[PDB]
Write a protein that binds this ligand. Structure first.
Ligand code: CYC
Ligand code: CYC
Ligand code: CYC
Ligand code: CYC
Ligand code: CYC
Ligand code: CYC
Ligand code: CYC
Ligand code: CYC
Ligand code: CYC
Lengths: 49, 160, 161, 160, 161, 161, 160, 161, 160, 160, 161
């Protein structure tokens, strides 16, 4: 029969910890504040607009 | 996503969402089913896309899998394919999100710095993603393929 | 800041998995409810000042708070109170549009209780005021959208507590 | 217009129009037929929309037309209906444009300053435009009325 | 910034008249050509690097200008020259999509003569180069679209001159 | 139309369940109120014309509305005003006995505001007159009856305005 | 309610409620307690009442429940019992109401058309209601049986 | 300290209402799940030593941490480390039985951060160790109970980090 | 709660829950539905219990409602009635929870200090709660009344 | 399975499944969820059971692992532990299937022949499976452990 | 003879894998739908004679096959036909219970086409009869289990074809 094994690349990039809501809430919001990219910067590019 | 970008841009100006933005999010909402379908196709054929696109990449860049290349050997070539798999996953995220923000933040800010630390060639990573785009387009219909191909195009453009 | 789609893809990204069938479910549900969210946002954008007006009248006016020595007294503090209500309503419409309460926690409710305690603002009275806003905004948007607005107005109330 | 606003944002970030932005430009141009049809209805019924809605405004707010009020006398009431006429014209322009930047550019930047200088009540002007919106609902089919209603919504929201 | 729709409604606004049927006709005509404008924009967006490269090679390169002492010499100067050509092409595609020359007139052309004369940048060479860009972009987009683009390129040429 | 008993029956039919204890006590409240209702209805019919006369005298008589150009300054106009007031009073007395506002919604308050507006009759003037009629009616009927009559008349006045 | 029927007649007559009409309303007020008690008895004995009625109706007309009959089979027989239960609940509502107004709007308007469409036999349904009337008389007081029998009788006549 | 039942009744108490039907539904759900919780606690209480042993072996052993100068080196510190792991598992099963994480925050994670920083304990190594505990205990109690033990273990991880 | 009390004791003993303690938790889990129903009927009859028991208390202790007493004046009497409602609410919580932990935490701890400051006689408060227990007993079956009566008994004993 | 056992017995007599046979199938399908859970615990802990049971087998029967024994060296001890894993897998199949037929077909018909050809001592294999049974009982709850223990018991009996 | 349960475990055995999450999902599906399968088996068992009768009537009676010179002519041959139709029904019911067509393959179809070609039995008429049974049994057992039966009846039809 066909062997039907997983490829190695699946295993290499698979997290095997069964993360749950507290872990996902933390591990998704780890790092510098998202307001570094969730902001806007204003410029007086054209006095006419 | 489009919704979060609109909310961010409006919060900075302290303005409730203008009708110009509200129609944009309404459009994205309406085409959501097609977007989910495209992503579902890509995740179904995750393993085929990565496998054969990687084979194309190694065919066009034999130096990469040749001895002394970055992805030389069984485990090293698997990590190279793992990176391609990561970018496919980011592409599906971007497709359902409706913008390139998830792709940009998760995997294109400092991509050159990371790959130069690793010693990997950025143009060869770009060609691998190009091969993935070709395979994914073959698995999509013409309208579906061109809608997703733009996310692939953003990824390769940042790689360059 | 997040929305429903961003939250779903971020959770899937944390677990290093392509979008699940359950994740696809959540995405579909948000898309099904999305057009309703957009219509409700249009309604309360038009009536934002009116919603604040009614809620202020219905719980914050002709009361000991607005009479002298009750914090809301003084024209400064009255303007600050109505401005805060506009803040709460605007961020509630942001949260309703996004389909996620992360905006409320990240930009509104972080440090808000601490500042209100320092200022002397009655956290109980603000909670009562925004519940009055909840009633008014529910009437304007409709029952279905009013439910959606409520799960974020109540979120703001709980943060204030 | 949608085209000019998209161009402005792309100009700020120094990017040629994205494929999705190009799709939106194409879509707006194609549905321009429906846009023109809605505007044609409104300009066809300029007389009754202003007249009926203004009478509803006067009834809802008797104080504006009372003695010692801003609209007392037929001369002043004629000018008041003239203002409602101007705002309906801006709304038709906005429907044609597909964006609210023409409406804002012409008649919502500084309305509080102008009307307070005149002595006119700004909330009363908002309620008159609300009356125009309600009159518009009967004139326009349900699908059409939602499209015109959003422009009316922006006018009243800025007015308040 | 102004476009075809904005110009039509602006003219009607100066007239103080609602949209006339003639004004509606002008809007219909712009809508008729908007389809071709979109695809032309897509084409030169993808080939923008090639277009600038080809024009630079056609007129700017292998000349005393890029030879020492010619002001295009030095890597910084070369990067600035191709940057200006990128600016001109991008603003040209904006004007082509809009159907109006307002963006060029206000965002680009004003003050450009003063800066170029002060710096010593050769306006004649820039006009020649953007003329070459016009020829290349016309070939790529097609004849009808090239007519649409070429007027805006010539508008920029006149502003420089 | 509907009654208190009929409305509870409708709600039970919607639920799809036989008479509950809650249904029993809601119906029993109507049963207890019946004596007050019927006595008040007889009084209202007996003094109906006097009620109208008293209300307009208290509110709109000897005023500019009665004076020339006031929408009541004609024999026909005055008769019409008295007629509409009697219409509201009769339907309100019906509705008070019924216990539900369905009768007033179905007949009394259907398109009335729009018709009044197009005619030019003042909605505010009608509302003031209705409140005056409510005061006169409460006095005539009695304290307990006046409270119920107030609720029904309030529905008519609020719907008109 | 009886008051509702009187109100409808008064509205058509364009006159305040007649003194005799108010007198009947007063009688309905007096009999509210007795009517509620009778309705409570019916609701309390609901399951047994319609169970016995179903057995009696199937005995009277065995072809309703026999092969080739409308209610042949357990599921359709249960549906037939539900239809009878719908009628029983309507009769309880009507007993509380003191008038035929509750029943007429539910199960006595167009009922013949609905039953003809589904295929159930209208005469057999009427007999089932009659069986319910007999069971109710057995389970109620003598004068309670008279009033309940009157409301039941209107239902039976409506089926005819 | 709180339970699922205690949390529900305390929320209703804060509002000042007797237990609503929604509150009753929460309580009924907890009662339905109580047997499953009791089973899972019976399992890991028997295997507590084995869970700690496997987790220590999988992540904490044959590394620099448990070789000279590693904070787990020295028998006193090794005993302390395994004692802390049994602490974490015991309180995690308390929280699982309760159905509320208030136990963990009130007891386990009050200044635990500060103590470990003072002691020099590596927070990251403890988090890795209790992650290994989570894997072992989830396998023992089964998937549905494991995802309940998992959230409490991850709550402890977040407090440490 | 049973769970919180068992875990408190086990925490002090530093033991995973003893098998017997787990068995008690199992039995509490199974009896929870009966507890919920008992609490349900108490809250349904909240109004009758309070008014009936309060009138019993005032009969037993006319001094408190007499002039020169704590509750004299309709307003003061009403607030005492509120206190009785509060304590019934705590008792319903305790019945659901299975222990006195919620009852004693929310109220009944600093009870003497609070009531000494208020001026009320705490034995009179206990008499009112006893009357509530009697009314609740009448509203419950003999088994159910025993379970609820124990929590009422704890409250009155602590008051004394 | 149990479905196959019922169907085989029915096929032999050329009769539709008797009501008793169908009763057994209904019990088995209703109990299937707990069966799958028991099997899942064994599969999830497949490494612990094999490792600890291997140690117990090697302690109790040191001759097999001693030099000159069948399982000498890690090369051959790996094969012995693999066979223990095989029989754990068969037992999980049996738990899911509800019968010992999966175990007997795959790995109990001819074990005497196979192991006597490989030279392996069958009584020692039996000790290994008994050790697996004890370890699995530690992992499983008592009620579930009894059910899984039956399948382990069938295996040890077959190899004795 | 091999069920869906035996099929799932045997496939995993061939791959040498413990029952994984995907195969366990297959088993969960079969266990869930087992109740419908069992009830339908009882229905067909009780009404076997009626199912065969109605099928023989709908497709085979009053035709060439029953008239002299046809196959079913003679009571011998007719009794054989109804016997074989019941065999097809009984084995289809076995297969529905199991969830696998292997029982049909091994016991029924293992040479059936050759036997019917040897005796001269009309394969087309047998197919018509089995499809008639498919219709009748679908009515008796309902649509939900009728589809599940239909796949196995279609299996027999294909084999005989
Ligand atoms: C690498 C060994 C580990 C790691 C690091 C990591 N760091 C950041 C972010 C920041 N780190 C610093 C620290 C410094 N600032 C300084 O000036 C100096 C030298 C005097 C140091 C050491 C700061 C200020 C930041 C935040 C600002 C920033 O964006 O850099 C991150 C997060 C980056 C982000 O969120 O975008 C990370 C991941 N991460 C690891 O896994 C290693 C163990
Ligand atoms: C007055 C000449 C005009 C006018 C006024 C009007 N005001 C209100 C209501 C409020 N006014 C205040 C004002 C103040 N609060 C302050 O703290 C200070 C400074 C010390 C001021 C001046 C407030 C708080 C209220 C709200 C009611 C309250 O006090 O609780 C009303 C009532 C509005 C309503 O419908 O509720 C009115 C009518 N009205 C006129 O016609 C004049 C021109
Ligand atoms: C109104 C319902 C109640 C009330 C309010 C009141 N608030 C303030 C002052 C502040 N409120 C905030 C809150 C926010 N800042 C934000 O940016 C946002 C959205 C992200 C919120 C919700 C802050 C920061 C201040 C202080 C700074 C400021 O003045 O703006 C005051 C003024 C208190 C003072 O005397 O300085 C008042 C009176 N008052 C009431 O009576 C209501 C119950
Ligand atoms: C060199 C090892 C690689 C390479 C280069 C290559 N360059 C050109 C053309 C030009 N190069 C320059 C460079 C400079 N201009 C400057 O002012 C300075 C600093 C003083 C530098 C370094 C310029 C201006 C040109 C344009 C032509 C010109 O000088 O006018 C070419 C020709 C490209 C063409 O097709 O036209 C090439 C091939 N090519 C390689 O293969 C090497 C890896
Ligand atoms: C040898 C005489 C006996 C024996 C011991 C044995 N020990 C281990 C593993 C460890 N031993 C230690 C011991 C210490 N840690 C300390 O800090 C100190 C004080 C300086 C001591 C003595 C530790 C920490 C370990 C853990 C592994 C590690 O160090 O990383 C093993 C291995 C156990 C295993 O299976 O993993 C063994 C076998 N075994 C015997 O048979 C002797 C009787
Ligand atoms: C008459 C004495 C009784 C009776 C009979 C009845 N029979 C049928 C139908 C069929 N009978 C046969 C019989 C035979 N087939 C044969 O090959 C032979 C031997 C050569 C015999 C005797 C068959 C085949 C049929 C089926 C129809 C057909 O011929 O194709 C019916 C019709 C039943 C139906 O609905 O299908 C009846 C009524 N009925 C009586 O009342 C008598 C007691
Ligand atoms: C009925 C739908 C049609 C039909 C059939 C017919 N069959 C036979 C005789 C035989 N049938 C079989 C078939 C099977 N053997 C099996 O093991 C199975 C599966 C469990 C089947 C289906 C065999 C072996 C025979 C021959 C021995 C016997 O007579 O039983 C006959 C009789 C033919 C004869 O010569 O005696 C008939 C008539 N005939 C029809 O008209 C229908 C269309
Ligand atoms: C344009 C047509 C028109 C007319 C005519 C008109 C009449 C009119 N007459 C009124 C009063 C009245 N009219 C009379 C009339 C009379 N009493 C007598 O003894 C005489 C026989 C008789 C006149 C000769 C009286 C006594 C009142 C006052 C009633 C009161 O308030 O007690 C009133 C109510 C008070 C008011 O004006 O607010 C009106 C409106 N209104 C109109 O719009
Ligand atoms: C749904 C039940 C119902 C309503 C509500 C109704 C109202 C109604 N009021 C009308 C007019 C009118 N109604 C009034 C009434 C008033 N004059 C006043 O000063 C007061 C402010 C006010 C009430 C006390 C007047 C003056 C007219 C116009 C009479 C005319 O000039 O011809 C008309 C136009 C036809 C007419 O002239 O009668 C309608 C249809 N008709 C209805 O069938």
């Amino acid at each position: 029969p066909e062997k039907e094994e997983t490829p190695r690349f699946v295993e290499l990039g698979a997290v095997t910890e069964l993360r749950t809501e507290p872990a996902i809430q933390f591990r998704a919001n780890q790092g510098v504040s998202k307001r570094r990219e969730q902001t806007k910067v204003f410029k007086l590019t054209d006095l006419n607009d | 996503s489009v919704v979060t970008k609109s909310i961010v841009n409006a919060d900075a100006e302290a303005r409730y969402l203008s009708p110009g933005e509200l129609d944009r999010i309404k459009n994205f909402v309406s085409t959501g089913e097609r977007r989910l379908r495209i992503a579902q196709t890509l995740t179904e054929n995750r393993e085929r896309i990565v496998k054969q696109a990687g084979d194309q990449l190694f065919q066009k860049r034999p130096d990469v899998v040749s001895p002394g290349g970055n992805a030389y050997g069984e485990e090293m070539t698997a990590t190279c394919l793992r990176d391609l798999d990561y970018y496919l996953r980011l592409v599906t995220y971007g497709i359902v999100a409706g913008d390139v923000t998830p792709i940009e933040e998760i995997g294109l800010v400092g991509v050159r710095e990371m790959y130069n630390s690793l010693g990997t060639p950025i143009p060869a990573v770009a060609e691998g993603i190009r091969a993935m785009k070709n395979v994914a387009c073959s698995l999509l219909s013409a309208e579906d393929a061109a809608e997703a191909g733009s996310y692939f195009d953003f990824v390769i453009g940042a790689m360059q | 800041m997040q929305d429903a789609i961003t939250a779903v893809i971020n959770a899937s990204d944390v677990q290093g998995k392509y979008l699940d069938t359950a994740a696809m479910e959540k995405l579909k549900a948000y898309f099904a409810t999305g057009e309703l969210r957009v219509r409700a946002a249009s309604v309360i954008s038009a009536n934002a000042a009116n919603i604040v007006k009614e809620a202020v009248a219905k719980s914050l006016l002709y009361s000991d708070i607005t009479r002298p020595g009750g914090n809301m007294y003084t024209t400064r503090r009255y303007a600050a109170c109505i401005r805060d209500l506009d803040y709460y309503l605007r961020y509630a419409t942001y949260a309703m549009l996004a389909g996620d309460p992360s905006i409320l926690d990240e930009r509104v409710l972080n440090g808000l209780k601490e500042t209100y305690n320092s200022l002397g603002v009655p956290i109980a009275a603000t909670v009562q005021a925004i519940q009055a806003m909840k009633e008014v905004t529910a009437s304007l948007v409709g029952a279905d959208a009013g439910k959606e607005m409520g799960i974020y107005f109540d979120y703001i109330c709980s943060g204030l507590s």
